[PDB]
Design a protein around this nucleic acid. Structure first.
Length: 167
DNA sequence: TTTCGGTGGCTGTCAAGCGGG
DNA sequence: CCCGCTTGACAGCCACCGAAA
């Protein structure tokens, strides 16, 4: 009825732009079966996954619903890719607006898992505070709940040419 | 009009367990 | 054993909808 599902075949179909769920449907297995093969035999990681390896917090649901979480993810993606070529127009507009707001009001983002959601932060967990010098070029506040790796310092700082993109 | 938060469904990963060599 | 799967639970991702400039 077919050829047993190997990592190479899934990777080939991914290169062709198919995702793991569609591949699972193609081979009559669960997406988890497709994921296991990728996880077990070292399948390439997308930019988002790479950014995830260097994510600064132990977040849960429903933190993923806050706009700060989504915008910071988009920012990490931009710094990793280095241009907007892999982002939709919406991600670009929203990210630039977020940067402009963040820069002009001199704030950095802080995370504390005990803060409960409130109006304008539907996922809870995040809050904006004014930058002090220890923050340098970072868009984030380092606190007891932030684990920042060597790779992370590059991801969570402003781009060097940030002034040119805004006007 | 365009902008921005909130929301939902879909996507993907991990841990533990099962069955066929 | 191990290898390939599935079940269940949780975290993250991205465009659409509507109300507020």
């Amino acid at each position: 009825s077919r050829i047993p599902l190997t990592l190479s075949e899934i990777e080939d179909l991914r290169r062709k732009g198919f995702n793991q769920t569609e591949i699972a449907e193609l081979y009559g297995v669960t997406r988890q079966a497709v994921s296991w093969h990728k996880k077990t035999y070292g399948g390439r990681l997308t930019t988002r996954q790479i950014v995830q390896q260097n994510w600064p917090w132990d977040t849960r649901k429903p933190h993923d619903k806050s706009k700060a979480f989504q915008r910071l993810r988009d920012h990490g993606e931009y710094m990793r890719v280095g241009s907007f070529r892999t982002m939709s127009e919406d991600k670009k507009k929203r990210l630039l607006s977020w940067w402009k707001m963040l820069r002009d009001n001199d704030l950095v983002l802080e995370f504390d898992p005990s803060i409960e959601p409130y109006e304008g932060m539907a996922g809870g967990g995040f809050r904006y505070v004014p930058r002090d010098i220890s923050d340098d070029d970072l868009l984030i506040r380092v606190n007891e709940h932030t684990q920042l790796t060597a790779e992370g310092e590059l991801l969570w700082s402003w781009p060097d040419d940030i002034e040119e993109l805004l006007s």
